Amino acid sequence: DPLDHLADKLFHSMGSDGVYARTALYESIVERLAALITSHREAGTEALRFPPVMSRAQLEKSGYLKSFPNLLGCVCGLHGTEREINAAVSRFDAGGDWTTSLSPADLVLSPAACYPVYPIAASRGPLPKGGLRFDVAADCFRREPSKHLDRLQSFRMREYVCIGTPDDVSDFRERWMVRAQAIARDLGLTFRVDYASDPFFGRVGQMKAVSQKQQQLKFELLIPLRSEEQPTACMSFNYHREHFGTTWGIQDANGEPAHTGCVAFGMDRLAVAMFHTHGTDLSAWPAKVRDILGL
Amino acid sequence: ADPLDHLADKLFHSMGSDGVYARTALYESIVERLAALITSHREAGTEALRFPPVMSRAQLEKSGYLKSFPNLLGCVCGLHGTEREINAAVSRFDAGGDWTTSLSPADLVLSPAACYPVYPIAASRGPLPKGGLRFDVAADCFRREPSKHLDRLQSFRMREYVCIGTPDDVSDFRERWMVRAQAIARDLGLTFRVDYASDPFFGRVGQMKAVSQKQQQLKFELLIPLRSEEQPTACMSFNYHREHFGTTWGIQDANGEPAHTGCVAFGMDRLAVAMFHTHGTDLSAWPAKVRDILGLQ
Amino acid sequence: KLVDVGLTSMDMVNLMLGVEAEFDFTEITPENF
Amino acid sequence: DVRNRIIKLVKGILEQNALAADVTPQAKLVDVGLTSMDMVNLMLGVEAEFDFTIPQSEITPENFQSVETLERMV
């Protein structure tokens, strides 16, 4: 793979595909990218930071199982008695299988940063005029093992989320599609923005994706890393219509089920994109790129 | 009501699960300033690694975690079956049933401490150089201990400096960090004591593992009275592992002997909550010297 | 445009179901819809 | 009576699996050289030599400081 050469300076193996330790070099660029994204945050945007786990009940209610059940990471634990747990450990000691004593907790690993924000927004009552905007971030998980450096299981996601009328969300997405491209341009990245679809599971899934594409509910900023025919999506721009509004009983200022949308930044994909484009030697990065990153 | 509960309004939002909370901007600004403070004390030659919130299950099993805290471990499970089996599971969910019966373990767990992945990484580099290796590691960690107390979370940030070398390397390292950690706590305006301690080893036998750990003085904690002087909160620990990880991972010091390891661990969320409980939630009202140390100006 | 008509995701889903039901057939792309 | 004399034996017994030292009733078990695995085996070598189960509130550094304190315990 064309990205493979970056591994030595950016990552250390943690004995599992798609799960890597991050070097100081790598993390310094993730941090600078995070700071750059923050500097573009719209006024009146509330910042929340989510842990890498969230309520399994909230995720189920959001309809995640209808869409990507194959990607979900669930938290499980030894929830039994001292006696049963001791027996699980004994099995392990004999080289047997302790994992049969596992049962699901009430938590999942969060598959996107925005999911926990909707119930939080709902609890505040009806939306003000102009809606609400959130700046959210989480370490996310997706059960898709791969050796490609742009396809991780554990990765950092940053999102700006808009909740309001169709117009509020539409205007928000349009601002951010322009703004995202300006950012990528100042970062010296090559890209295009194109219609896209989420990888819905199953036969029925395939068709949901076709319809999503036709309705243009999802755009991606695609950067050609390994090839120009197989570019990597490093940002997405998502319109959910009233799905979360209806699910969580969120009402806009005109008493209608709120619409929602988000702009998502894949922090690890953007950092890998930067190192691939500009190399691992930061002193040699282009002057304007070093400038806009505060290097 | 627990003495920390008043802090919830300004620091956290409910995520529908005890010990798992959304962090407000106010709260995160302080966690970030604390992290930066700790970084400013990093020793030269210390290698900085950042770990994700999951790690290899095989590596954690090998490290002996199940013999010690099987009850605290969060494992990753997923739907690893065929498309038919997965569709059926989702359909049971639709029909009032339990889809989780189709779950099976992945090869990952949620990391219970930040330093666990560092030992295999160190081991892969061959024998240690004279003086050993020092690492600066951080991870979002997980411990399966649901609680409503704001100083007892299920998901929390841990920052550690780790020493791998001879017994003398590690003891010198721990001694210096115990002095430095206390100076940091004083600069932060925190009230604390340092005391011998033990890990909560599971089960009957575990209580004895803990006794021995206390007796051998393998573990100190910096303890901050948050709800009471009699039940203080451990916000940092200073841990000596003797040769446990060295033997486990076949790490050899410069003398050809199994390496000893130790670490100083900072509980970032406990420290943050400690700061807010001590100085209150209005940052402009914090002591000027504390504000200076944290670079708030 | 089948989408300009007013067919959304659940509509298009039920649409792929109706074609498989009326005739006897059961890949799925944007072009053909 | 001879409880103390047996406790000094099971300690030397555990030490036999490694190396020997000077065992006395006032010496700290940890200064003798007992480690966590040693202390665990000893908790059970005391339960097997006296056929009883040690209470949880008695699994303490206090009772397990020395042979003398273990003696007073059992």
Ligand SMILES: Nc1ncnc2c1ncn2[C@@H]1O[C@H](COP(=O)(O)O)[C@@H](O)[C@H]1O
């Ligand atoms: N498996 C993955 N590895 C790394 N980054 C990812 C992965 N999946 C998604 N991302 C990033 O997260 C963003 C949002 O994800 P999505 O919700 O699938 O559009 C994407 O545009 C990518 O930048």
Ligand SMILES: Nc1ncnc2c1ncn2[C@@H]1O[C@H](COP(=O)(O)O)[C@@H](O)[C@H]1O
């Ligand atoms: N449940 C928890 N919630 C918050 N912080 C924790 C928790 N468990 C441990 N910590 C922090 O992590 C540090 C190291 O953990 P330990 O390995 O148990 O010594 C402690 O000193 C605490 O500051």
Ligand SMILES: [Zn+2]
């Ligand atoms: Zn989102």
Ligand SMILES: [Zn+2]
């Ligand atoms: Zn550690």
